[PDB]
């Protein structure tokens, strides 16, 4: 299976590790992990176009959209600020034109989204 991973980092307490797995090229991508340091409640969760972190999350560009392909909806943080992520998505991919490897995963201040709290470049994983 194709696998990817992303370490989310930002200016404040928000941080997380998100994993991706896709068993076949025309199949769904499993996305799972956790994000900490969030306000309790809903937060926008998107793939943005560029894997450019030269200005932190500011340089990631817009939502990836070759719904937007990059729109993975919202994640929910508990009372301790921890969001569990467990998503299966059939629009994103780890190959082809909807490929998100080398792009940026971003978690937002608000639900969908306000400021970009944390982000990371999506990389090939073992």
2-9 and 41-48 strand pairing: unpaired
- C-beta closer to a second copy: residue 42 or 107: 107
Count of other CB atoms within 10 angstroms of residue 104: 26
Q: Is 5 in the site for a second copy (CB under 8 A)?
A: yes
Choosing from 82, 111, 112, 121, the residue that interacts with a second copy (CB under 8 A) is 121
Closest by Cα among 98, 97, 100, 99 to 121: 100
Do the beta carbons of residue 20 and residue 94 sit within 8 Å?
Answer: yes
Which partner, Zn ion, a second copy, none, binds residue 4 by CB below 5 to 8 Å per kind? a second copy
Question: Which residues are part of a known binding site for Zn(2+)?
Answer: 63, 68, 71
Question: Which residues are part of a known binding site for Cu cation?
Answer: 46, 48, 63, 108
């Amino acid at each position: 299976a194709t696998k990817a991973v992303c370490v989310l980092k930002g200016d404040g307490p928000v941080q997380g590790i998100i994993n991706f797995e896709q068993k076949e090229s025309n199949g769904p991508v499993k996305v799972w992990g956790s994000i900490k340091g969030l306000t309790e409640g809903l937060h926008g969760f998107h793939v943005h176009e560029f894997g450019d972190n030269t200005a932190g999350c500011t340089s990631a560009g817009p939502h990836f959209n070759p719904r937007h392909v990059g729109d993975l909806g919202n994640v929910t943080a508990d009372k301790d600020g921890v969001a569990d992520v467990s998503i299966e998505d059939s629009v994103i991919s780890l190959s082809g034109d909807h490929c998100i490897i080398g792009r940026t995963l971003v978690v937002h201040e608000k639900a969908v989204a306000g400021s970009r709290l944390a982000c990371g470049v999506i990389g090939i994983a073992q």
